[model samples]
Each structure stands twice: as C-alpha cells, then as structure tokens.
Target chain A: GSHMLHWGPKYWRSLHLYAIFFSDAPSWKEKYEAIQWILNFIESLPCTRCQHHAFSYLTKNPLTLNNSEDFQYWTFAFHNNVNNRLNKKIISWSEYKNIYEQSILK
Target chain B: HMLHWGPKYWRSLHLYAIFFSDAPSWKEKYEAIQWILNFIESLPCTRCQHHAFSYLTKNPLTLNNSEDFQYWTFAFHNNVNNRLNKKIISWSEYKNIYEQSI
Candidate 1:
C-alpha cells in the first residue's frame, strides 16, 4: 500500500489534469462543475493543516469563474501559493500554461 | 459526455475493489464514501451529477465492512443503471463479470 504522504503528488496532479480538461472543454456548466469540484476537492482533503492554509488563501483571493482561462489561471495562482510556502521555484504563468496545458501524463 | 463512461467504468469498479478488499481499514472505508462523492462531482455530465447528488440526500453512506462495502457499491451502481434504463446485473452475476477467479 502507498504511504499517505505520497498521495500529495497524485492528488495535485489530478487537480491539474481536471483543470486542464475543464479549461479545454469550454462551457458554462463545465466551468460551474470545475469550481464546484475544486472547492470540494479542497474541502474534502484529509489534511487539516493543509486545508487551513488553502482555505485562508481562498478567502482573500476568491475563484474566478467567468471564463475557462480565468478558472485555469486561478488554479495556477492557488498552486503557486503552495509553491511559495514550500520555498520551491514558483511557476510563471507562461511556464504554468506550457507545462499544464497539454498533459504528458499517460 | 457518454463517451467518458469507458474510462469511468473500470476506475469506479477498481477503486471500490481496493476499499472492499480484505485488508482495508476504517479510514479506507470512510475515504471510499468521499471518493464516491468526488466521482459524482467529477463526471462531465452536469445532469448526471445533479441526479447523483439527490440520490445521496436520502441514502447517506454507511456499512463499514468489506462485504457490506461490496454489496453497497453493487447496489449503488445497480441504482444508477436502473435510472438509466440499463440492464441491472444481479448480485450473483456481479462476481463472474467483475471479479477474477484466482
């Protein structure tokens, strides 16, 4: 069985994958589902410590739901927020789009 | 949206199999419930998701055991198939079709 800690990467990867899927689909209902899934994804996270920080960030920077680009951009910012806290190299918007736009994951 | 069912078909069954396996813990069972909820939300079909949400309002997930979890998932899928006017696979037929003989 995989360790609980290892779930972080898989979960985060799926987050981006679904974001890209919704972003590419381009629909009002798809955007609505994207927002709902994102919120539920965070809310249902088993990590209480991580949830606090993510929710705190959301309180200040609310989700952008107008268009697919805005929705995708909001997720990138949210992802960068975590990267900043972890002291990892923050992804530029261009780099983020380049890396996440077309998923290489098989 | 219906084309997505091919991917979802195996994934839903595979996920439940792991949770209903002999070694799953209470934590796994709880997570199973959440995974079901998450799966519903993740489906590309908005109308399908709306119906799933309504189904859960009355039948909140319980049954914290391996056998019960399997049966619960079986019944759950059967409920969905019923609504879609698909063929309802009975419990006895479920094993031969979905399970491997090892």
Candidate 2:
C-alpha cells in the first residue's frame, strides 16, 4: 500500500471549480475513465528501493498557502515518474480546467 | 474552491503508519519529470468531446504486520501519445499501514 497521492487545497479547489462548472458536460465519462485507469495502472507499478529522499517543499511548515510551489513540484515529480505514459496537457491545470469547463461540466 | 484529492481514509492512515514504524526508505526521486512527459503525449491532437467518468474506492483492507507491508511505488500521470508529463509518487510504507488498519 503506497502512500496515496494528494492534491493540496489550492489545487483541490481548482479541481472543484472544474468539476462543479463542468459536472454535466459531454464526454465526461471518457475523461474520468481515462484518468481513473491511469491511476490504477500506476498504483500497480513496482516499488522503488532507493533511499528515502525528502522532497523539497516550498513552505517551511505544512498546509500553508505559499506551499503551492511544493504541491506543483510534487505533482510534477509524480507525473514524470509514474504517469509518463499518459498525456501531460490534459492534466495541466489550465488544460484540465479548460476541458472540464468546455466539455464535461458545461 | 476546488476539492483537493487526498488519499482515501484507509490510504491516508497507511501512510501515517508507515512513517511511524519504518526508519526510512528510498524512492525513485527523479522519475517525476518522465511521468509529466508521458502525460503530455497522451492527449489528443485536438480536444475530443469525450465522456467523463469517476470512481471511488472504499477504505483499503488493513494489514496485521510489517510482513504484509511489501513496498510499492506508483507513477500517477502519463501522456496519451507518450511524451512529456509529471508524476505523483507513493511509497510502500503508506500501503503497509492501510493493510493493518484504518
């Protein structure tokens, strides 16, 4: 059981907006399924045996507003390593939200 | 405001428990960028009018001991065409705790 990935508050809020505004938009099913399948595939990958490296955090403390950079960094890290098989722009904040607004939640 | 997608209840507890029990472990640190690239490649040339689907999983089954906590890693994001992307990581310790309880 690996530690589950998390989207920070700021990112989460953006997701909420995308979800709320595009909750009923077209092709929502395909997009959700695609992302879900990707997550499941990643969860099933081999474990890393390297030394635990403390990821750099922008904030000195946990749960701070300025920690957006840390979240972005971590997210970038996750994408490059595990999800290298999926499309990137689809998940990029703007593109992700744009699709949400334009196709799904509309 | 957006809903931050944190680990589910069982998964979150698993992560905390691993942090407590194990001393330390190594994770492939530099793989994040590769995941980002993959993610970028997977997108359609033009946005497609696709359906959006979602799924939710229940709390994970708890494990009884460290033996059950075999380490695993995840690369969360990849591209459709298999190009540039990002990564979200997870460790085995996080899974171990979930196997035991919570």
Candidate 3:
C-alpha cells in the first residue's frame, strides 16, 4: 500500500495553547473538539502541564490531504521557544529546518 | 488493593530467556515450553555493535557444595595464553577477593 503521511500547516497558523489532540484516524471532527476539551481540561486544573509556556498546537487535520514538512518546522520552532523562554542556547537557523526534516524520515 | 506477585526459577539459566515464561498467570507449562521450542525455527545470527567482544558471566555456581560467584577468571598461568600482559582496568587484591566472595 502507498503510505502518504500528512503533516499539519505552518507554525504561524497554530493556536498556542497548553494542550492539543492529534490523530490521522477517522474521527477528525472529534479530534479537533478533543483538542479544545484538552485546553479547557488544563485550564480547569490547579497547575497546567505546560504552565507559562507557549505550546503551538497541530493535528494531521484531514481537511487537506496534502503531505508536507511543516510538522518538523513547528517542532523546531517549539524547541526554540522553550529554549528562548528558559534562557538556553537556541538552534542555529541554518541547521534547524534540515535536522528536523531528517528526523521525520528516520 | 487485592493484588499479588512472585518469582519462579526455571530449570536452566538459558531457559529463563523465554519471553512469556516470566508471566505468573500463564498456565500449561508443558504446552508453553513446547510452543516456545517449536517457534524457534533455526535461530539466526543478528549483528550487534559488540558482537566480537567476550563477555564476563556474573552468576553464582556450585562446585562440590561450595558456592562460588563465577567471574571471567583470566587464566594467567597457561603457557600458550596469547593475551597476557594486556593492560586492563586493574583491581586491588582486596577488591578482587571481595568481588569473588560475593
């Protein structure tokens, strides 16, 4: 079978939240709703899992069946954000995109 | 809070390597052993990083009613021993005796 794996959209498009739900399975609508539920679930708790941290959300949203390398880019962005927040060394921009892209294929 | 667990020793040290043998709830020991052996259709050699190196076995063995922790005892007295004078992580006499006794 020809396996076509789809990654989500651009980093800029993501709604930075504490929690997210992702799936490539049948219940795409429910999965999107689940993401919102997870956000509310975290908000209701005394301590959020990722407190004071910007977590950009993504899912293999089945609306667009196009496969792309955006997930890798977003992961790098997330890593960079966390590093920046904690005053740690950020990945060099030149190497960031390529390294992430290589990981996905592995 | 109604849970329990235990350990059971199999016949040989080699026999304990069977994957599902550790499961306490599994019955039919004879059938299980038979099934395991039947599935072992000519074991193939898989390459690993440290395949060529000799490994030290650290297990208890009995010799004439005396318990001995068998280590990789280097035979230094052998006249034909080729790997003599090879520098290794040296242990003190006290440390060697203590390790062997344990």
Best by DockQ: 2
Q: Tens-digit lDDT track for model 3 on B1-102?
A: 101210011112122222223332212332332232232211122121011111111111111111111111222112112333434433354245445333
Query: Which ranking of candidates, highest lDDT first?
Result: 1, 2, 3
Task: Output the lDDT of residue B42, model 2.
Answer: 34
For candidate 2, lDDT tens digit of each residue in A1-106? 4333342234434433433433232243333333333334323333322111111111111211123233333444443433443343225656544634543423
Which CAPRI quality tier does the interface of model 1 achieve?
A: incorrect
Predicted candidate 1 versus true structure: per-residue lDDT over A1-106, tens digit per residue: 3343587777777777665555544554454455456657766566755755665565457566655567667778888888898897897999977787556232
Model 3: residues with Cα > 4 Å off, grouped in runs: A1-49, A55-67, A97-102, B1-102
lDDT for each residue of candidate 1 in B21-100, tens digit (9 for 90 to 100):
56655446545555665666556765665555545544555445666666666776788789879899888887766566
lDDT of 2 by residue, B1-102 (tens): 102322242243235334432322211111221222232223232121010000111112122332232232121111211323324334554345355553
Q: What is candidate 2's local distance difference test score?
A: 0.29
Error of 1 at A70 (Å): 1.6
Ranking by DockQ: 2, 1, 3
Per-residue lDDT for A1-106 in model 3, tens only? 2111121222222322211113334243343343333334323323223322321122112112112233334445665765686697797756754544433332
Q: What C-alpha lDDT, on a 0 to 100 scale, does residue B23 get in candidate 3? A: 33
Off by over 4 Å in 1: A1-5, A23-28, A104-106, B1-102
**TM-score (C-alpha, index-matched) for candidate 1:** 0.44
Chain A TM per candidate, in order of listing:
0.75, 0.23, 0.37
